[PDB]
């Protein structure tokens, strides 16, 4: 198979500044007919790949003029002259010289902004849920940048593992921040066997980790 | 315009087959290869195979040889892909893709909208909706929407009147095979004694419509 190597993997861009994405092929994608079988596409959540540039350098209909593509047979560059919020998403190169069609690793373009620390909030389980036999404890990390953050749960000051799941929002169009929700899940019995519930948050915007906590029964 | 329209979302149990249809318009169907690509969550896209509509000739990737069958119906301008023996790792959005080259010239691809295929033994279930109560500036509150299947749920606040500061998170799949999600909103601490906060949760597959008041404990 033809191997595509894409760089960088992560591309935070300050509004109005340009972006360049590189892709290299393990063999030439310049066919002897003169066609370059390399294409660039943008993947946003819940919709089809959107073709940006086809056959090496042709702009697809409706794609802004700020997108362009060039390259040799082996080395290719997608250029975006300015990066809007609308441009945020996952960019892939793909070759179609041969089947199987192969894809680069993808570049995650986001808006770069000033570092913002998360506001942290802890929520105990509701009485209604406790009646059902399960306890969900939720930690919210609100409106931070960059995306890297770590939540560590502690129950009676003991480090928790394997009993939590998280998810992260898409970058906010207005303020360029992310938010994260983490849910610690325990049985009612296990919940009643401990007193202190804490989430400790590590983030670049925080000088030291921030802990929010509660005691079962107020 | 060149258009490729695929069939709807599929939920299938492990071992079951799935057959996705891809109806085309705006070009001569016979003249272009139809390819199939998928992208699973947490994976790069993956080329499955192609059909040549004029001959009906197929070519599949090594990994799907023996489990995929591509066909077409010329009279309906439609291509089909049937994938058998579904496993969890086949959960993916599946695309049909018109080719680039007609024999004479080469151009862009055109993609269908995608068909989500979810591989799961879970049955339809409506969520329970629990409050995330604001603590004793800026305050946070929310709703935990727990133990539902399949996706999606929708959440609004105060019947759509509260939109600023709302974050409705991607669902997580629990080991029970049910989804859970949280929706939160940040509001002024000053409003907590006086402003009513209600999350409006909808889950269409189970005909669930819940309005949960969220208030200080």
């Amino acid at each position: 198979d033809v191997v595509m190597t894409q760089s960088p993997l992560s591309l935070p861009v300050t509004p109005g500044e340009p972006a360049s994405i590189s892709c290299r092929s393990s063999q030439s994608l310049l066919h002897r007919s003169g066609h370059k079988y390399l294409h660039w596409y943008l993947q946003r959540p819940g919709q089809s790949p959107q073709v940006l540039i086809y056959l090496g350098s042709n702009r697809a209909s409706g794609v802004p003029d700020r997108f362009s593509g060039s390259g040799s047979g082996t080395d290719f560059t997608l250029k975006i002259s300015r990066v809007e919020a609308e441009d945020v998403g996952l960019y892939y190169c793909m070759q179609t010289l041969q089947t199987p069609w192969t894809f680069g690793q993808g570049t995650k373009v986001e808006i770069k902004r000033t570092v913002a620390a998360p506001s942290v909030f802890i929520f105990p389980p509701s009485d209604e849920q406790l009646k059902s036999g399960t306890a969900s404890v939720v930690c919210l990390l609100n409106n931070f940048y960059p995306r890297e953050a770590k939540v560590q749960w502690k129950v009676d000051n003991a480090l928790q593992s394997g009993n939590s799941q998280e998810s992260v929002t898409e970058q906010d169009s207005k303020d360029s921040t992310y938010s994260l929700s983490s849910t610690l899940t325990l049985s009612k019995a296990d919940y009643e066997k401990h007193k202190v519930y804490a989430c400790e948050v590590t983030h670049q915007g925080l000088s030291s980790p921030v802990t929010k906590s509660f005691n079962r029964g107020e | 315009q060149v258009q490729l329209v695929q069939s709807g979302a599929e939920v299938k149990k492990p071992g079951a087959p799935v057959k996705v249809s891809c109806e085309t318009s705006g070009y001569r169907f016979s003249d272009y290869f139809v390819h199939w690509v998928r992208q699973a969550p947490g994976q790069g896209p993956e080329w499955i195979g192609r059909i040549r509509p004029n001959s009906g000739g197929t070519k599949y990737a090594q990994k799907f040889q023996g489990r995929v069958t591509m066909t077409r119906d010329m009279s309906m301008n439609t291509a089909y892909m049937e994938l058998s023996g579904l496993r969890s790792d086949d959960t993916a959005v599946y695309y049909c893709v018109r080719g680039h080259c007609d024999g004479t010239t080469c151009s862009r691809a055109y993609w269908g909208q995608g068909t989500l295929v979810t591989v799961s033994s879970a049955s339809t279930k409506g969520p329970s909706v629990f409050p995330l109560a604001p603590s004793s500036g800026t305050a946070a509150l929310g709703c935990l929407v727990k133990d539902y299947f399949p996706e999606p749920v929708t959440v609004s606040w105060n019947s759509g009147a509260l939109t600023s500061g709302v974050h409705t998170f991607p669902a997580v799949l629990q080991s029970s095979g049910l989804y859970s999600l949280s929706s939160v909103v940040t509001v002024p601490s000053s409003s907590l004694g006086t402003q009513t906060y209600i999350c409006n949760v909808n889950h269409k597959p189970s005909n669930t419509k819940v309005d949960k008041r969220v208030e200080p404990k």
């Binding site: 007919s33 041969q98 | 680039h100």
Partner: peptide, 9 residues
């Protein structure tokens, strides 16, 4: 079982 770039030839 040719690929489409090779059709014209």
């Amino acid at each position: 079982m040719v690929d489409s770039p090779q059709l014209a030839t």
